[PDB]
Design a protein around this nucleic acid. Sequence first.
DNA 1: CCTGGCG
DNA 2: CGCGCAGG
Length: 257
Amino acid sequence: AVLKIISWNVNGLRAVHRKGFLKWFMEEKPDILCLQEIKAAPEQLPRKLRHVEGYRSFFTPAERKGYSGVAMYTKVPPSSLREGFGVERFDTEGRIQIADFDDFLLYNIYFPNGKMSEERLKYKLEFYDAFLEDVNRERDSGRNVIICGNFNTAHREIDLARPKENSNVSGFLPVERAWIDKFIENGYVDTFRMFNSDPGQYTWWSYRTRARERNVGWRLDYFFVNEEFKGKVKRSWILSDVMGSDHCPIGLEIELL
DNA sequence: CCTGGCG
DNA sequence: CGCGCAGG
């Protein structure tokens, strides 16, 4: 009895719907699908997206018209669904879906991009900070956590095609690479690295300069568990072939109880 | 129906 | 490049 979970930074759900989304969503059959950067409120989506037979859908849209936003489809509904950490700034941008699956917490997080500004960065890290204290509190409470989404940060050099030219860009800043160390040091396993240790494995590629076409990308989308849960995940992979976004989907699968 | 934020 | 958004 294995639970397949998919994360995807979708970059416009209305757009991905126009590029075969649902077709894939039913071909690939995941018990939980977490989507990030949805760029929509639910009343903007076609009913075909709001209502997917088999799945209860949940949407956390920002209070900024078609910006950010996370979503989730799921066969077995969560016992409850939290949408923020407890700080307005982070809570109001459709970035947080913590969904209690009475077995584990599934954290669907779209972490802030810090490319575009120093004050939008910073926000990214303070967001990171707010997330950690939170996940800590939950797994200290003995709750097992699965965290997926768009971290917007390559952890180590191996997590992007061109680390060296990228030292100064947000996404591979030593400041942000630091936090993931902290994050892991706090007892979280980068589930993908539990299986693959090869380079050139990515989940993001710049649209401009047609980067995807030749694998010149980054690994920004992650599946994480707590050390204590490491045992019960039996594959974290990357759906490198799924199209219609500058990111791509990443898969996990876990176990019964 | 084009065209000119964030990522 | 791509998404969406607003507003001529």
